[PDB]
């Protein structure tokens, strides 16, 4: 019989949920010393044999397979923060372990049941947006020298902080660049385009706004530098098309199978005669493109690629300003591309490259990343993306909130004066946000070589003088403040990185059993 | 389950568990197997069967305790009757088929009793109370043939002998066999006509020549020849003489040595000259005290030196080696002499006195066989049985035993019946009376105790070929018309139904313990509900 | 139990058949093994458990609807909770734990009373004889939905439906979406009938924020992706035109199995140009006809796009066949699966086209929506949840379903009963006096009826790490005297239930928690039928697979 | 439990039986004689069993009393033929239709099946299923005409008779124009709609562009021929066949068909269409020259009733009155 076929037998009480409270505290003790500055790296290897080396909280967890089937809700919190903003991946795990690893003493100890814990923790969550939207103050949105110190704030935990005065650069025109007036500036990662060219030099790096392809000229005779381009995308190949129909011709006279020959070259020939009536410069296409198809476009000087990215045709339309049009009777020299220039095929011999320069309001941009080696340009790649991630958050509000433990800290302090307040059932679990606050300013320390005990010993007692700027600095662990070096974050990486923890925290409390063997 | 192994005993999956009427019915149909082989057996037209030990020995018997002693079974109900036939072969020694069928139709009748609905023990209640009103019912019928003379009280002894000779293998020689085991208590037995000694008698079997050459020798017969035998086989007596006077001694011919260990140091050669003297001197001893006492044959139990031999032999003086202490008992009962512990207490009032001493040839080769016979009447009888088969020789000895059996059981006082199926007839009548008088819930209980007993007949009539229906209403239409009780079933075809002109005559002390074993087996039996057997 | 009974002794058959009271016993334990689970997620004390497909996969199920849905059980009468469970889905909506519960007691209870040698045709119409008597006195307690002056019905039943759920601390801010959406959808037949088409309302996944930030769409919102980058994101003005079309607009092969057989060479292009020019015949006629939004059930085909990007038409693919008919009502639009009429000839009537508000297309957290809010013919709704990870969101996709079956059955019938333990406590004493008077061997299941209800209050005490005695002893005080309380409102006594939170007695109106009526009635009916079915089964065979 | 994974829970002995898988080649002789019991009177199943095993079990003995088996064979022959006897003098006849009778045999007759306490109104319905059908000859009522269809969801009491001929198979609700047909004649289609193809292999060969200009408007004005003599005879309601040769239904032919406001329900069983049309008094129609007004039907009625997820198409009532009416009864429960 054996009844239920699936974990007949069950793992119930506390024994369930210190097995959830325990793989929910493995995954955030393996990125404590992925937090901070001095923060080290870490290698994933996959059965692929791809290796990932990098800082981030998100790509560690992604790539680790975790057997604990609590623990992989862990693996997919960095998922929510990357998705939404892509900055404070590690500072969620970091919390949200803190948050259980602070809550277990509860169950087992003072036996206070989940929900009126869940009670606490959305309470507390509520007080912690108040105190997190007080410490925060407006900045100007339009102010360039101050949006480059805001973008160091997650650099300076990179590897790329040695070129953060060049990356600063890269990162600032390229979110300006693909941003429109409309929710704002709507700004999208699709837009911005990161190519991965191995070899060159970092120090040497440069926006481009268009789009890089690696595909050559279909012919030796195409001009490879154009003074004024002219760009007409076109989805239909050049090839011969054939009917889907399977259309079988019976031939019976000796020209007809001579005319059928010729039919296939007229009609190549007059697709390229209305591609000629606007005369363009540049023909680009995402599929194949016949030898016949080539020679009667080199006496319009009509330069031709062939087997483009789907995507890339998207970004083309938006800085030459062509319009895609499948068939070839409908182009118009509205459709054409305008205002692009500087079109040239520069020689590298890995594969060839084409550049494109512009002079409705939506474009797009190229940024070409020059590294040491491929793998080390993979983690370029990911610092820029999560350096763009936070001038997102600045254009979207103008609120703007300290960092580097001074936000955390000054919620903890908050919480600690309201729970002496309550005198209830709910006092205990109320403490607990407190004090998982408290583990980011933490691991800042442990991570520079200080002592943690002096130092947060005193540092809570500044917040106490009515100061909320005062911070743990990163390299001499000082306790000065954040506003004379300068370390700033966006209030929505602050709010994202609280409200997932809390979240996630009810979640795995309120599970009191683990069965395994369904198979559906 | 909730997911943990659960385990009350331990070898959990090796015992099964039987409850409910799924397992009475597999208690029943047990017993009908068991009935079903034994009731082809039953009766003087009954058959023997083959039984085939694991060593490669064949048993050929119908008898129900030796066919079910050496039955390798599985179910313990079956077991229950191999122990049933065994009890009722060791006390009475009759009646062992009888028992086994009886208590399998008690059974058959109490399983259709179960399915009406009726509780176990108001059946088993109901069969003990049927058991005492059918035992006092033919109590009263039977008579008292101690009235009678010693010479009639032999022909009553030879009327339960043929007909425990029946039904069984070699029954053609019954009239002879008859006659023999009714001297063997003739001879053996007490002046008052009471509680006879059976271990006087010994069964001492034989294989070869033919049946016809079984007769009674009163004495000993042992396997153990005379030790050098250049002297007669055959011992004479003198001329004049009180008997042949025979010795029995159970201490070998040796010079004296302690029973512990010794160690007898000759540190000259003066002293190693007078062991020489003393050696010659003990053997020289010896045969003078057995001389001077008018022994002739003597019998050792650990034998002797080949030095004796020729001493033996000057006075001519018989001896035995190597026999059998349980022997050495036999042989002094027969003689009426007295075990001699050494020479020293030899005295002529301790020898035993038979007839002659003498030795058979037997076969060609086989073995030497000693043999003693008595010159009056003894407390100690052999039989002597022959065949030309070992299987035949085998089976007449417990043939033989049983008819014993039968013939010790009527030296108790004041019990007979008459045998043919007239017992079952007689009690299965009254029981079927009392039930119309009692009425109530345990009517039913003695109408299936009157059934089981009218079985038997019924069981004769099958293996002689009759009519079990126009027998067993032939036999109850004769009880309610008349109060004679001897009318039964004829399985010789005989005529004359009437039990008194057939002389078939049976112990009542073996019918009554054949109610007894049946209804107090059947008791136990239905008041099994698990059954708990583990695997082997 | 204890040993294995023997195999088949005389009566021959290939499989494996027990009889006795050793088959009663394992259709208990089959209820007793699978009740365990349900037990301890019944009630706001109730916590969720998580199910793993050995894949790598997790599964958070609060309720025992999916929970006995995925958990494989072989045994045949374990089956039928199973079943039941699956079931009560289908009515209700919503009991799928108290229904398993309640059924695995009267079975749990009823093997004692078969040791008595009491025959089950005795126990079973104990059990329907107090049954008829208890959905009789439940129509008897009930409340009229009128109470105030104002409501205070709709927000206080969904919160009962929010209870046992992660969001039951949130339940205060979803009480008013769940009111709100269901009567936008809200349609009419019968003549006069209104129906209330649940699942009408969308549910939308989304990372980010926090469950207590997630907006109501006063509309309707397509979970899909835009055709084209190059049309227009946003859509704005009054009154847009919306095309729904369940016909191909990719281009497609002529008829099915014919074979196109060509002589003349120079028809050999003119043939394969009007392949292509048929398909965009109909576009011709929706862009002439003002339709902004054209959705599609099948793709679109890169002809179709060329023409929507000039003439500014927001294309759409790939659509479900069941998320078109909500948006062809709620827009106005009428559903058209080709074009043509009574008539021979072939055109597109403006009629066809929808209108609304506003058209926007909305992305977060990788998830992209087109929201259309505004409709003017017939109104919807939408509801985007936002959680932790989808798995989070699994959970609180089917906790606002559950929540859309219990305000149904309230509009539809206005008798609520009150919650947390009213209707099992207040059965008890009413079926005290009534085994009473009947008397014979229906006394004793009728009495172990009503006690076979105590588990439901019973086990919101145990589940919330309380002492059981002190709530039931004193909840059993106010039952014992109402029905004593005798008229004279001063009468009360009644209406009172068990607060985990507190751990005091206080009456349910008050505290919010109601409970339909209808719901009470298809639970005990759903939940003896299958004890009943268990209870005549005397024999179990099991027969090998060959 | 079945070898298949299908487990039934049946009362009657032959079922029991029947599933049940015997090792003994004579103990499977007792399948067929429950078999017998259930083909000709249909009750007694369980006990004719247990007669049989009871005759064996009395003359099991008589084997041991010296009876030859053809003599107790004989016997049981010759005491079963006066046993009828016996029975024909103790019953008594009974009237054509009597509601006393008839009620309180088929509620004693049920006994121990699950519905013996909702016999309270099974047991008419029973009775007034088999008065429909009257005759003086005592023909053996065919149950054809009685269609018991299930339906999983519900609850027992909610068993009813209904009025008119329902239908298993949903609609087909592609097109799903209308929602509730009033005062329709319900129509049969035993052809297929569809565009014209021979049941045979053909060919259609394009020599020019404008040939495809035409095929694709003739093969919709076929389809919409077929709705125009449909119209002029007022046919809300039609019933195709499944045809798996040949499709039934077309997106061409359901929107044509939406427009008039005709309901259509497919997938049909063919041995159904004996209860369809002297149910509902419809002849056939398998081909469009032969459809006319007079083979058409009436019925006031045909919706489609969503109950707690179970979606059931019922007709209520029909004008045709013909020789013999059907019976149709909806069965529900809450377990399978
Ligand atoms: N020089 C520094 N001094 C103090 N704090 C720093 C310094 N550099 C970085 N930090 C803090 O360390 C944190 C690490 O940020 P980062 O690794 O980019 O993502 P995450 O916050 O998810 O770990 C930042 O939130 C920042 O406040
Ligand atoms: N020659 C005979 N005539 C009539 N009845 C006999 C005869 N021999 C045996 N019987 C009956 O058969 C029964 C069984 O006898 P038998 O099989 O010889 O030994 P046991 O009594 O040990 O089974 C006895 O009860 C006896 O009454
Ligand atoms: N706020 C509350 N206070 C007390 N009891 C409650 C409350 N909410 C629900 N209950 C009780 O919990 C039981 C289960 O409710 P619910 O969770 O809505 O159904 P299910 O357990 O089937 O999902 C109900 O019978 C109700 O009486
Ligand atoms: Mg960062
Ligand atoms: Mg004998
Ligand atoms: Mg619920
Ligand atoms: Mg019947």
Known sequence: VVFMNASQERTTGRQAQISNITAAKAVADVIRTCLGPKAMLKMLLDPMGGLVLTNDGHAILREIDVAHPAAKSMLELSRTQDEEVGDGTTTVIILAGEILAQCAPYLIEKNIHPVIIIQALKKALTDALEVIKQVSKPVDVENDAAMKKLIQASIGTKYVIHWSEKMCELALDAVKTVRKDLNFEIDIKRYVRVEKIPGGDVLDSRVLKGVLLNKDVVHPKMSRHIENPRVVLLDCPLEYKKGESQTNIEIEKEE?????????????????????????????????????????????????????????????????????????????????????????????????????????????????????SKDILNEIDRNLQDAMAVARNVMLSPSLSPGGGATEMAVSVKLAEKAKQLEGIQQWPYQAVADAMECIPRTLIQNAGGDPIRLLSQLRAKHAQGNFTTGIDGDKGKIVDMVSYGIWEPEVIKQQSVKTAIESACLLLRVDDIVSGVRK | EMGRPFIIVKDQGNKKRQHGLEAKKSHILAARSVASIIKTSLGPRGLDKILISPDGEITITNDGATILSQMELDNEIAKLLVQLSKSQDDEIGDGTTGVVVLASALLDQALELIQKGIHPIKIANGFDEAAKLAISKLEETCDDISASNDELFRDFLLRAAKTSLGSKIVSKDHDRFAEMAVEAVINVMDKDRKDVDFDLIKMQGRVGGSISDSKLINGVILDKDFSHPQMPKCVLPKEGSDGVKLAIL?????????????????????????????????????????????????????????????????????????????????????????????????????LGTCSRIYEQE???????????????????????????????????????????????????????????????????????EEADKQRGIDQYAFRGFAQALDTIPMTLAENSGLDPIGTLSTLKSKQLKEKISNIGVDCLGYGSNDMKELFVVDPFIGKKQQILLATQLCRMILKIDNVIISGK | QLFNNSRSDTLFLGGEKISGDDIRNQNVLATMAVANVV???????????????????????????????????????????????????????????????????????????????????????????????????????????????????????????????????????????????????????????????????????????????????????????????????????????????????????????????????????????????????????????????????????????????????????????????????????????????????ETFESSYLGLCDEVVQAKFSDDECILIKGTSKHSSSSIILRGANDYSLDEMERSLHDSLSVVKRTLESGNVVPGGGCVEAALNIYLDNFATTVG???????????????????????????????????????????????????????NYGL?????????????????????????????????????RIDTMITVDPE | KTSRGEIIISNDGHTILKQMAILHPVARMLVEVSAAQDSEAGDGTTSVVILTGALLGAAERLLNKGIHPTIIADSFQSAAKRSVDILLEMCHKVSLSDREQLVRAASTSLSSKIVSQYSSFLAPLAVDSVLKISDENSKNVDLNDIRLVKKVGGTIDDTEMIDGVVLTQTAIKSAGGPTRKEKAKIGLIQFQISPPKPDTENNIIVNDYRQMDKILKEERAYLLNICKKIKKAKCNVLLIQKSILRDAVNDLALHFLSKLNIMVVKDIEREEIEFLSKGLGCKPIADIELFTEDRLGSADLVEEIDSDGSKIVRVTGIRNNNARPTVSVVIRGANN
């Open chain 3, 499 to 535: 607060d985990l939170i507190r751990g005091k007695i206080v009456d349910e109106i008050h505290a919010g928690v109601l409970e339909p009526t209808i719901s009470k009635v298809k639970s005990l009916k759903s939940a003896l039928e299958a004890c009943v079915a268990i209870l």
């Open chain 2, 362 to 432: 037997f076969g060609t080769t086989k073995d030497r066989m000693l043999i003693i016979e008595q010159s009056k009447e003894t407390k100690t009888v052999t039989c002597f049985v022959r065949g030309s088969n070992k299987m035949i020789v085998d089976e007449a000895e417990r043939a033989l035993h049983d008819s014993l059996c039968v013939v010790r059981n009527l030296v108790k006082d004041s019990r007979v019946v008459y045998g043919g199926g007239a017992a079952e007839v007689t009690m299965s009548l009254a029981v079927s």
């Open chain 1, 256 to 372: 007809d199978w001579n005319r059928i020959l010729q039919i296939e070259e007229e009609q190549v020939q007059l697709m390229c005669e209305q591609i000629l009536a606007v005369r363009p410069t540049l023909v680009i296409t995402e599929k194949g493109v016949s030898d016949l198809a080539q020679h009667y476009l080199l006496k319009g000087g009509c330069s031709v690629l062939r087997r483009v990215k789907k995507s890339d045709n998207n970004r083309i339309a938006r800085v030459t300003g062509a319009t895609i049009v499948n068939r070839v009777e409908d182009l118009k020299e509205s459709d054409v591309g305008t205002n692009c220039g500087l079109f040239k095929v520069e020689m590298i011999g890995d594969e060839y490259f084409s550049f494109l320069d512009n002079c409705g309001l939506q474009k797009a941009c190229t940024i070409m990343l020059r590294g040491g």
């Open chain 3, 440 to 494: 014979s061997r229906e006394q004793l299941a009728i009495a172990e009826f009503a006690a076979a209800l105590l588990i439901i209050p019973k086990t919101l005490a145990v589940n919330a790490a309380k002492d059981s005695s002190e709530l039931v002893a004193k909840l059993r005080s106010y039952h014992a005297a109402s029905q004593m309380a005798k008229p004279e409102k001063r009468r009360s006594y009644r």
């Open chain 2, 250 to 350: 159970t201490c070998p011919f040796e010079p004296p040595k302690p029973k512990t260990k010794h160690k007898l140091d000759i540190s000259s050669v003066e002293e190693y000259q007078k062991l020489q003297t003393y050696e010659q001197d003990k053997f020289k001893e010896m045969i003078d005290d057995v001389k001077k006492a008018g022994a002739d044959v003597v019998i050792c139990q650990w034998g002797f030196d080949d030095e004796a031999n020729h001493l033996l032999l000057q006075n001519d003086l018989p001896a035995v080696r190597w026999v059998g202490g349980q022997e050495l008992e036999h042989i002094a009962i027969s003689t009426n002499g007295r075990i001699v512990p050494r020479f020293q207490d030899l005295s002529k009032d301790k």
């Open chain 3, 39 to 345: 037990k301890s997620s019944l009630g706001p004390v109730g916590l969720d458990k998580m199910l793993v497909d050995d894949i790598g996969d997790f599964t958070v199920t609060n309720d025992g609807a999916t929970i006995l849905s995925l958990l494989d059980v072989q045994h045949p009468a374990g089956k039928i909770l199973v079943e039941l469970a699956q079931q009560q889905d289908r009515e209700i909506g919503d009991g799928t734990t108290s229904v398993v519960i309640i059924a695995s007691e009267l079975l749990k209870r009823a093997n004692e009373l078969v040791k008595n040698k009491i025959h089950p045709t005795t126990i079973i119409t104990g059990f329907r004889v107090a049954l008829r008597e208890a959905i009789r006195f439940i129509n008897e307690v009930l409340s009229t939905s009128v109470d105030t002056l104002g409501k205070e019905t709709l927000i206080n039943i969904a919160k009962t439906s929010m209870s046992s759920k992660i969001i039951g601390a949130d339940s205060d801010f979803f009480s008013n979406m769940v009111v709100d959406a269901l009567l936008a959808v809200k349609t009419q037949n019968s003549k006069g009938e209104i129906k209330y088409p649940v699942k009408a309302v969308n549910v939308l996944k989304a990372h980010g924020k926090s469950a207590t930030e997630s907006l109501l769409v006063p509309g309707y919102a397509l979970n899909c992706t835009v055709a084209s980058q190059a049309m227009p994101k946003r859509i704005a003005g009054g009154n847009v035109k919306i095309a729904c079309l369940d016909l191909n607009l990719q281009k497609a092969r002529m008829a099915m199995g014919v074979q196109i057989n060509i002589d003349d060479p120079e028809q050999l292009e003119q043939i394969r140009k009007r392949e292509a020019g048929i398909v965009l015949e109909r576009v011709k006629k929706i862009i002439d006809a003002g339709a902004q939004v054209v959705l599609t059930t099948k793709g679109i085909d890169d002809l179709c796009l060329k023409e929507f990007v000039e003439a500014k038409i927001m294309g759409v693919r790939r659509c479900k066949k069941e998320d078109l008919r909500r948006i062809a009502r709620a827009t106005g639009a009428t559903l058209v699966s080709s074009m043509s009429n009574l008539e021979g000839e």
